């Protein structure tokens, strides 16, 4: 074994938020949608087991898991927050996952809707053969 391999994949993290016309009963003022995907519709399912979106404690059932695309959550509330996103790979070893602190921000009323995209590069050094294969079918 001399041959070394480095694999990169691109994730995208992003979200939409817009002002409701009529606030909800809880006084939710905004509707929003956060998600994770690969670019140009790449099958990230090949190497992603699951994604967990950690909503703020103010949310009931805050820890939201998607095992299958689309990796997203659609919700209503009243303010933005730091939104930890855990992406879990189909990997027998390190890294088993990765954490991002996703700035889920809203805009005030009178301002345009949020439409935010955060591109993220992951690098893997000398994954197993199995994981290298899933990574690269993606």
């Amino acid at each position: 074994m001399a041959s070394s391999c480095a694999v990169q994949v691109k994730l995208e993290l992003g979200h939409r938020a817009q002002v409701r016309k009529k606030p909800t009963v809880e006084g939710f003022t905004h509707d929003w949608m956060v998600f994770v995907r690969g670019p140009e519709h790449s099958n990230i399912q090949h190497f992603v087991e699951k994604v967990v979106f950690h909503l703020h404690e103010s949310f009931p059932r805050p820890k939201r898991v998607c095992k299958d695309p689309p990796y997203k959550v659609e919700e209503s509330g009243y303010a933005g927050f730091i939104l930890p996103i855990e992406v879990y790979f189909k990997n027998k070893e390190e890294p088993r996952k990765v954490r991002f602190d996703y700035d889920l921000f809203l805009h005030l009323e009178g301002h345009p809707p949020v439409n935010h995209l955060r591109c993220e590069k992951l690098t893997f050094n000398n994954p197993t053969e199995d994981f290298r294969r899933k990574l690269l079918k993606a």
Binding site: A79, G80, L108
Partner: peptide, 4 residues
């Protein structure tokens, strides 16, 4: 607006 942000939630602590």
């Amino acid at each position: 607006l942000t939630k602590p």
